[PDB]
């Protein structure tokens, strides 16, 4: 035919939001045929002008972006492809903000955005120390240490040899030895067992901050480069509740099922019921008020500073969320 069909004009018209901070992520998961993780990653590929400036074939592009998403798991209500697919956008968007204009080179753009996309790729829904408890092979093979991020990215990077799957075929040695250590420096640092001391190193940095005659943030160093990616994706990872509260809701309720079914799990084995897993002892609200008092408000407070005033509105979207959990506290 050569035209849209009418399903898929309405999913490019959702998709002229991807620019945006709260993009319709679970009405591009519908309209795409649960490809929200491909037709999105796509898109910011183009937009980005990627496929060109890495030489990356188009077809083998859409090849390897199906098979990541098709090894996220369908029945894991939260760390599934619809979550990668949110987190490579809201990664999208924290990397074209002012304050970083000009700061990142390609490479660094295509790592952090395709870190993004594997960064919970085969994620069973349970979390490291259920993996570790059961004596599961993963923990076995990964030392029970940060178990599952080493996984996500061991998977992220195996999936590149199926068949036409080598979307880097065309980068130089040099290219793939530099994406891949920051590419495998972000994931690693998405572990929340690593979140303190990211916050901690973000902190000083942001009191260290320097920031050029153009006004965007000076980072002459790999440390200082890949720490600002490290907490820029953590923070996407981290952004639900940033979210219009339509949407916050939507991944409160998926964290709560995949929670809950983990505490079904560990009940029905006789283990001891993890940190907020027990349906018939939660507190939702109060949970999520403690969440982001404590993890996502600290850190997205410290990001708003590094990047000042760019992310204004996205911290007083989260501050008006708390406050709308706060008030439905029972
Ligand atoms: C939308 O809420 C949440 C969204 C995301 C996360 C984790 C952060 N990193 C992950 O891999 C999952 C926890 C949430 O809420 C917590 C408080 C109550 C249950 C867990
Ligand atoms: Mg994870
Ligand atoms: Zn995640």
């Given at each position: ?6 399903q ?28 929200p ?66 700061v ?37 093979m ?26 880097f ?6 290219q ?25 190193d ?9 920031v ?6 000076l ?16 923070c ?40 907020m ?15 982001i ?21 996205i911290?007083?979207?989260?501050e ?11």
């Amino acid at each position: 035919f050569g035209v849209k069909t009418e399903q898929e004009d309405v999913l490019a018209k959702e998709l002229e939001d991807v620019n945006k901070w709260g993009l319709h992520v679970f009405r591009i998961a519908e309209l795409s045929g649960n490809r929200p993780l491909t037709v999105i990653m796509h898109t910011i590929f183009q937009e980005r002008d990627l496929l060109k400036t890495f030489k990356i074939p188009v077809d083998t592009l859409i090849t390897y972006l199906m098979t990541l998403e098709d090894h996220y798991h369908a029945d894991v209500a939260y760390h599934n492809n619809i979550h990668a697919a949110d987190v490579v956008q809201s990664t999208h968007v924290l990397l074209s903000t002012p304050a970083l204009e000009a700061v990142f080179t390609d490479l660094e753009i295509l790592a952090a955005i395709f870190a993004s996309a594997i960064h919970d790729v085969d994620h069973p829904g349970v979390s490291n120390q259920f993996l570790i408890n059961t004596n599961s092979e993963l923990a076995l093979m990964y030392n029970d240490s940060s178990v599952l991020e080493n996984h996500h990215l061991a998977v992220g990077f195996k999936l590149l040899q199926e068949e036409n799957c080598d979307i880097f075929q065309n980068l130089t040695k040099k290219q793939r030895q530099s994406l891949r250590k920051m590419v495998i420096d972000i994931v690693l640092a998405t572990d929340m067992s690593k979140h303190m001391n990211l916050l901690a190193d973000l902190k000083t940095m942001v009191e260290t901050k320097k920031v050029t005659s153009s006004g965007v943030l000076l980072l002459d160093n790999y440390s200082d480069r890949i720490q600002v990616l490290q907490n820029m994706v953590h923070c996407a990872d981290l952004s639900n509740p940033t979210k219009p509260l339509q949407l916050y809701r939507q991944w409160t309720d998926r964290i709560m099922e995949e929670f809950f079914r983990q505490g079904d799990r560990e009940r029905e084995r006789g283990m001891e019921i993890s940190p907020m897993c027990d349906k018939h002892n939660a507190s939702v609200e109060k949970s999520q008020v403690g969440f982001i008092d404590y993890i996502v408000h600290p850190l997205w407070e410290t990001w708003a500073d590094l990047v000042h005033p760019d992310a204004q509105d996205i911290l007083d979207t989260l501050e008006d969320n708390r406050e709308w959990y706060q008030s439905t506290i029972p």
